[PDB]
Short mmCIF file of C-alpha atoms and ligand atoms in Angstrom, two decimals:
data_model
loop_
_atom_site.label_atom_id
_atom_site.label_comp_id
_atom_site.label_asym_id
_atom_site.label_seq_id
_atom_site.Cartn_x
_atom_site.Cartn_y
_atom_site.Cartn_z
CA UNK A 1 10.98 -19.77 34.76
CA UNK A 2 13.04 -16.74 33.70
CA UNK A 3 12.08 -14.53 31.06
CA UNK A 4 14.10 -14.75 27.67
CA UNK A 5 13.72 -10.60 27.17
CA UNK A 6 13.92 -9.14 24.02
CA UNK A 7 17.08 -7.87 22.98
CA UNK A 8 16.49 -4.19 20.58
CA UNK A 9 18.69 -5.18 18.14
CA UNK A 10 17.81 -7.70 15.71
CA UNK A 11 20.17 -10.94 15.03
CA UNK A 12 19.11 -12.75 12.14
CA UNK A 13 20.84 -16.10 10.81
CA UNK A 14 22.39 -14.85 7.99
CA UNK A 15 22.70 -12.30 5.04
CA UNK A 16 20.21 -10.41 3.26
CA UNK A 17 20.55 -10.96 -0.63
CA UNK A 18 22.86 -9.31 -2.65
CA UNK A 19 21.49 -6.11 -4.02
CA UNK A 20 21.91 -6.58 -8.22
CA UNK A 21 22.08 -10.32 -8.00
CA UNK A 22 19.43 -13.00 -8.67
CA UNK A 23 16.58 -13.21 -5.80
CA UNK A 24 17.07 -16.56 -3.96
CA UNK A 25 14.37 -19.26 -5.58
CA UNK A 26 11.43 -19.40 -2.61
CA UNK A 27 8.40 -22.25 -2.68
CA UNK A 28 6.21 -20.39 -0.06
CA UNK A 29 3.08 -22.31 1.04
CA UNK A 30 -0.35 -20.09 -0.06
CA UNK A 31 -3.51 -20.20 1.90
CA UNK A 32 -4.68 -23.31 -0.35
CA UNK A 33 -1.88 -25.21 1.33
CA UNK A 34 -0.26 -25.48 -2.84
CA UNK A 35 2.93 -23.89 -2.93
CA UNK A 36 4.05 -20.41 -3.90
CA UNK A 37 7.35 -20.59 -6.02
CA UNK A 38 9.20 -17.72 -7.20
CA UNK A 39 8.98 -19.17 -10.84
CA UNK A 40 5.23 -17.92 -10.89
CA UNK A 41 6.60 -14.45 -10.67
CA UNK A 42 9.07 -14.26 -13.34
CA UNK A 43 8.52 -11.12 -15.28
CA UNK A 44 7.14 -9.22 -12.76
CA UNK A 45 8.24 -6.76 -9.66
CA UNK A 46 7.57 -8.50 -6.31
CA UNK A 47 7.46 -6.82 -3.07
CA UNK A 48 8.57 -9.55 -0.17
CA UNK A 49 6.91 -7.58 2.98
CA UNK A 50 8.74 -9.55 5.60
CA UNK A 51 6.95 -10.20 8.93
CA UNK A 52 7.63 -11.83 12.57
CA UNK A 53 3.71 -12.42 12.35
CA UNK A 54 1.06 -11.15 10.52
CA UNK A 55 -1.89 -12.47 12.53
CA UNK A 56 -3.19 -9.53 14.73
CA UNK A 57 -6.34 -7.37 14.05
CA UNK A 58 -4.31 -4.45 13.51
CA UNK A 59 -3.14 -3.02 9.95
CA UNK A 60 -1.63 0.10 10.46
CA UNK A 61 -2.33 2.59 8.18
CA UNK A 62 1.43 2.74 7.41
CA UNK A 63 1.34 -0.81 6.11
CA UNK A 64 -2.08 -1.02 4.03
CA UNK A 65 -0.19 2.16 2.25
CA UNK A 66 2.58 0.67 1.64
CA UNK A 67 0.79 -2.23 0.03
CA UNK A 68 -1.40 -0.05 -1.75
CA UNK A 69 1.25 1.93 -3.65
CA UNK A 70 3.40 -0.96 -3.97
CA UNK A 71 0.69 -2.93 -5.72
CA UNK A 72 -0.17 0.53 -7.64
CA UNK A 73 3.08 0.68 -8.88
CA UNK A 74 2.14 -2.85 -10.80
CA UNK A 75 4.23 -5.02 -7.99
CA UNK A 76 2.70 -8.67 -6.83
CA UNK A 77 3.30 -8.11 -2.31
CA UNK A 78 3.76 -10.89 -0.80
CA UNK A 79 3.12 -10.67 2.79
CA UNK A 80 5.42 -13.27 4.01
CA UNK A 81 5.68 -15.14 7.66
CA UNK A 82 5.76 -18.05 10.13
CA UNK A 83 2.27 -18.19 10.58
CA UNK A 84 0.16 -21.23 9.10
CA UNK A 85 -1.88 -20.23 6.10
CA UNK A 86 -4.80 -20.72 8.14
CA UNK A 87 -3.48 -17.37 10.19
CA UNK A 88 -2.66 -15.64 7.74
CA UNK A 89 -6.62 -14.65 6.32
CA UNK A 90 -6.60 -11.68 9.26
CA UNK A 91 -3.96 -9.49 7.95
CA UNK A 92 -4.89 -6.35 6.31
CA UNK A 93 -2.64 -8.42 -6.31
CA UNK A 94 -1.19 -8.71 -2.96
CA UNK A 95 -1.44 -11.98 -1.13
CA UNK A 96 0.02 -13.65 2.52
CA UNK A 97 2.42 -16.51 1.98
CA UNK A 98 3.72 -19.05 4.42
CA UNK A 99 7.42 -19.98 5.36
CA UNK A 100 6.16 -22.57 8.15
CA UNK A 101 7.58 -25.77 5.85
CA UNK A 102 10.03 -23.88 3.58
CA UNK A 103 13.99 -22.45 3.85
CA UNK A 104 12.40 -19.34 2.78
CA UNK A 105 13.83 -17.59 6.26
CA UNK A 106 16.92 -19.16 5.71
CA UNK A 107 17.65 -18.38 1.83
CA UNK A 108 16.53 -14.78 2.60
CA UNK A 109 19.08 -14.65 6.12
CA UNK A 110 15.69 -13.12 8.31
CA UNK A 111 14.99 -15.61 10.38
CA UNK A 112 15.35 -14.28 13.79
CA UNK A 113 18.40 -15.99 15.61
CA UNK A 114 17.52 -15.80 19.67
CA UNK A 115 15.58 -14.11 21.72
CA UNK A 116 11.58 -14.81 22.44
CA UNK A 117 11.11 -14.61 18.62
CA UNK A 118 13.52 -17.02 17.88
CA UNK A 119 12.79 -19.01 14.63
CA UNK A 120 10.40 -16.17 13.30
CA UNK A 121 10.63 -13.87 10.32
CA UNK A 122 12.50 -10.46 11.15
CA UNK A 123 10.65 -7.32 9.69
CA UNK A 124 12.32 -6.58 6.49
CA UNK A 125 11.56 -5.64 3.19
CA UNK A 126 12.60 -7.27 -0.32
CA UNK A 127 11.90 -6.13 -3.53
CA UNK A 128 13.00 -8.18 -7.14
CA UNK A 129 12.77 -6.46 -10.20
CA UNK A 130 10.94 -7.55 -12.92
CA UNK A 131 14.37 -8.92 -14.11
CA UNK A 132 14.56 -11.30 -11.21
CA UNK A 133 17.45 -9.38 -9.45
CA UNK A 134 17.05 -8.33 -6.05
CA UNK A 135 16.61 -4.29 -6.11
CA UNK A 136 16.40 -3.50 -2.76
CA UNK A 137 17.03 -4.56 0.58
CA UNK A 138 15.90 -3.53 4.15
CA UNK A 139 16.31 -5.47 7.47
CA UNK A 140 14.89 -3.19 10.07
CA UNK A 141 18.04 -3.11 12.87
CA UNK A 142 16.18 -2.64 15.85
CA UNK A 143 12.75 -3.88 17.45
CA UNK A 144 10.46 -0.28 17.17
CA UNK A 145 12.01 0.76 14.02
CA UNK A 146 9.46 1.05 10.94
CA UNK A 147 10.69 0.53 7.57
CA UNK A 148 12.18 2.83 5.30
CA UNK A 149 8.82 3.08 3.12
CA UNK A 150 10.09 5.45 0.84
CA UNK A 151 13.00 4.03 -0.35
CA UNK A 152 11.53 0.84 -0.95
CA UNK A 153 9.16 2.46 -3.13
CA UNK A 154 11.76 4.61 -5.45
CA UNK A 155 13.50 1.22 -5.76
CA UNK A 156 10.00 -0.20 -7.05
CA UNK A 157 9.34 2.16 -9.23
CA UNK A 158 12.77 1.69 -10.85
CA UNK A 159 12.53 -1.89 -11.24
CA UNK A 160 8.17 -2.18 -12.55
N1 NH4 B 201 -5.29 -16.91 13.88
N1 NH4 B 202 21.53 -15.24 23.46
Y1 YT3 B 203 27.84 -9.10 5.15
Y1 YT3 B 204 10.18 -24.31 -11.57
Y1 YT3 B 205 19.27 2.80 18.16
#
Protein backbone atom coordinates (compact mmCIF):
# COMPACT_ATOMS: atom_id res chain seq x y z
CA UNK A 1 0.00 0.00 0.00
CA UNK A 2 1.12 3.63 -0.34
CA UNK A 3 0.67 6.08 2.22
CA UNK A 4 -2.10 8.84 1.64
CA UNK A 5 0.31 11.67 3.59
CA UNK A 6 -1.07 14.50 5.07
CA UNK A 7 -1.16 17.50 3.16
CA UNK A 8 -0.48 20.98 5.82
CA UNK A 9 -3.06 22.79 4.46
CA UNK A 10 -6.51 22.03 5.24
CA UNK A 11 -9.28 21.45 2.34
CA UNK A 12 -12.59 21.33 3.68
CA UNK A 13 -15.89 20.72 1.52
CA UNK A 14 -17.24 23.90 1.65
CA UNK A 15 -17.76 27.39 3.35
CA UNK A 16 -17.70 28.38 6.80
CA UNK A 17 -20.98 30.36 7.74
CA UNK A 18 -21.51 33.73 7.05
CA UNK A 19 -20.33 35.93 9.84
CA UNK A 20 -23.79 38.17 10.85
CA UNK A 21 -26.13 35.66 9.34
CA UNK A 22 -28.28 32.93 10.95
CA UNK A 23 -26.14 29.76 12.29
CA UNK A 24 -27.02 26.76 10.03
CA UNK A 25 -29.88 24.53 12.03
CA UNK A 26 -27.61 21.31 13.43
CA UNK A 27 -29.41 17.94 15.09
CA UNK A 28 -26.11 16.62 16.67
CA UNK A 29 -26.41 13.17 18.30
CA UNK A 30 -25.59 13.53 22.44
CA UNK A 31 -24.04 10.78 24.41
CA UNK A 32 -27.73 9.39 25.18
CA UNK A 33 -27.88 8.60 21.49
CA UNK A 34 -31.25 11.55 21.52
CA UNK A 35 -30.42 14.26 19.34
CA UNK A 36 -28.88 17.66 19.93
CA UNK A 37 -30.75 20.38 17.79
CA UNK A 38 -29.80 23.86 17.61
CA UNK A 39 -33.47 24.82 18.64
CA UNK A 40 -32.48 23.80 22.33
CA UNK A 41 -30.09 26.66 22.26
CA UNK A 42 -32.07 29.51 21.17
CA UNK A 43 -31.40 32.39 23.44
CA UNK A 44 -28.19 31.55 24.37
CA UNK A 45 -24.30 32.01 23.13
CA UNK A 46 -22.93 28.65 21.88
CA UNK A 47 -19.39 27.90 21.37
CA UNK A 48 -19.10 25.03 18.41
CA UNK A 49 -15.37 23.76 19.37
CA UNK A 50 -14.81 21.91 16.14
CA UNK A 51 -12.67 18.72 16.25
CA UNK A 52 -11.08 15.95 13.77
CA UNK A 53 -11.44 13.73 17.03
CA UNK A 54 -11.83 14.26 20.43
CA UNK A 55 -11.06 10.79 21.79
CA UNK A 56 -7.41 10.85 23.12
CA UNK A 57 -6.31 11.09 26.84
CA UNK A 58 -4.87 14.33 26.29
CA UNK A 59 -6.63 17.85 27.08
CA UNK A 60 -4.25 20.39 26.66
CA UNK A 61 -4.26 22.96 28.96
CA UNK A 62 -4.92 25.37 26.05
CA UNK A 63 -8.25 23.70 25.37
CA UNK A 64 -9.77 23.01 29.01
CA UNK A 65 -9.07 27.05 29.14
CA UNK A 66 -10.66 27.79 26.45
CA UNK A 67 -13.70 25.87 27.58
CA UNK A 68 -13.46 27.21 30.89
CA UNK A 69 -13.70 30.91 29.97
CA UNK A 70 -15.96 30.25 27.23
CA UNK A 71 -18.44 28.57 29.53
CA UNK A 72 -17.53 31.50 32.18
CA UNK A 73 -18.51 33.91 29.87
CA UNK A 74 -22.24 32.17 30.17
CA UNK A 75 -21.69 30.22 26.59
CA UNK A 76 -23.18 26.39 26.22
CA UNK A 77 -19.47 24.54 24.24
CA UNK A 78 -20.23 22.09 22.34
CA UNK A 79 -17.37 19.92 21.65
CA UNK A 80 -18.31 18.66 18.32
CA UNK A 81 -16.84 15.52 16.10
CA UNK A 82 -16.94 12.26 14.12
CA UNK A 83 -16.52 10.16 16.93
CA UNK A 84 -19.55 7.92 18.25
CA UNK A 85 -21.01 9.24 21.46
CA UNK A 86 -19.67 6.31 23.06
CA UNK A 87 -15.99 8.05 22.33
CA UNK A 88 -16.70 10.96 23.11
CA UNK A 89 -16.90 10.43 27.39
CA UNK A 90 -12.73 10.78 27.33
CA UNK A 91 -12.39 14.27 26.28
CA UNK A 92 -11.47 16.80 28.77
CA UNK A 93 -22.36 23.60 30.73
CA UNK A 94 -20.14 22.26 28.16
CA UNK A 95 -20.93 18.94 26.57
CA UNK A 96 -19.40 16.54 23.40
CA UNK A 97 -21.82 16.15 20.53
CA UNK A 98 -21.76 13.76 17.64
CA UNK A 99 -21.87 14.47 13.77
CA UNK A 100 -21.44 10.57 12.95
CA UNK A 101 -25.36 10.44 11.46
CA UNK A 102 -25.92 14.19 10.82
CA UNK A 103 -24.96 16.97 7.80
CA UNK A 104 -23.61 18.83 10.64
CA UNK A 105 -19.92 18.76 8.74
CA UNK A 106 -21.54 19.57 5.72
CA UNK A 107 -23.94 22.62 6.78
CA UNK A 108 -20.92 24.01 8.71
CA UNK A 109 -18.33 23.41 5.26
CA UNK A 110 -15.52 21.51 7.92
CA UNK A 111 -15.60 18.36 6.90
CA UNK A 112 -12.19 17.52 5.80
CA UNK A 113 -12.12 16.89 1.91
CA UNK A 114 -8.93 14.32 1.25
CA UNK A 115 -6.18 13.33 2.76
CA UNK A 116 -5.91 10.45 5.71
CA UNK A 117 -8.60 12.47 7.58
CA UNK A 118 -10.87 12.51 4.94
CA UNK A 119 -14.58 12.64 6.07
CA UNK A 120 -13.56 14.06 9.61
CA UNK A 121 -14.26 17.36 11.29
CA UNK A 122 -11.47 20.09 10.55
CA UNK A 123 -10.38 22.06 13.77
CA UNK A 124 -12.35 25.17 13.76
CA UNK A 125 -14.14 27.25 15.95
CA UNK A 126 -17.90 28.64 15.77
CA UNK A 127 -19.50 30.84 17.94
CA UNK A 128 -23.61 32.05 17.60
CA UNK A 129 -24.73 34.77 19.52
CA UNK A 130 -27.39 34.66 21.72
CA UNK A 131 -29.36 36.13 18.72
CA UNK A 132 -28.79 33.03 16.67
CA UNK A 133 -26.35 34.77 14.19
CA UNK A 134 -23.09 33.37 13.66
CA UNK A 135 -20.43 35.86 15.45
CA UNK A 136 -17.40 34.41 14.68
CA UNK A 137 -15.64 32.16 12.55
CA UNK A 138 -12.24 30.28 12.57
CA UNK A 139 -11.09 27.36 10.33
CA UNK A 140 -7.56 26.70 11.39
CA UNK A 141 -5.58 26.77 7.67
CA UNK A 142 -2.95 24.49 8.35
CA UNK A 143 -2.41 21.06 10.30
CA UNK A 144 -0.12 22.45 13.62
CA UNK A 145 -1.85 25.67 13.79
CA UNK A 146 -3.82 26.30 17.23
CA UNK A 147 -6.73 28.46 17.22
CA UNK A 148 -6.97 31.99 17.56
CA UNK A 149 -8.26 31.69 21.35
CA UNK A 150 -8.45 35.16 21.91
CA UNK A 151 -10.42 36.34 19.34
CA UNK A 152 -12.92 33.84 19.72
CA UNK A 153 -13.35 34.93 23.12
CA UNK A 154 -13.77 38.95 22.47
CA UNK A 155 -16.35 37.75 19.91
CA UNK A 156 -18.08 35.78 22.92
CA UNK A 157 -18.10 38.22 25.10
CA UNK A 158 -19.80 40.54 22.57
CA UNK A 159 -22.45 38.26 21.68
CA UNK A 160 -23.40 36.62 25.83
N1 LIG B 1 -12.84 5.39 22.70
N1 LIG C 1 -5.93 14.58 -3.41
Y1 LIG D 1 -15.80 32.02 -0.03
Y1 LIG E 1 -37.50 22.43 16.10
Y1 LIG F 1 2.23 28.35 6.71
Amino acid sequence: AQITLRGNAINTVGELPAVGSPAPAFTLTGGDLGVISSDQFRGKSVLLNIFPSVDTPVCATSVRTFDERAAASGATVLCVSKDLPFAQKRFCNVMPASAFRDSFGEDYGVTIADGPMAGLLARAIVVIGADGNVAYTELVPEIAQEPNYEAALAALGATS
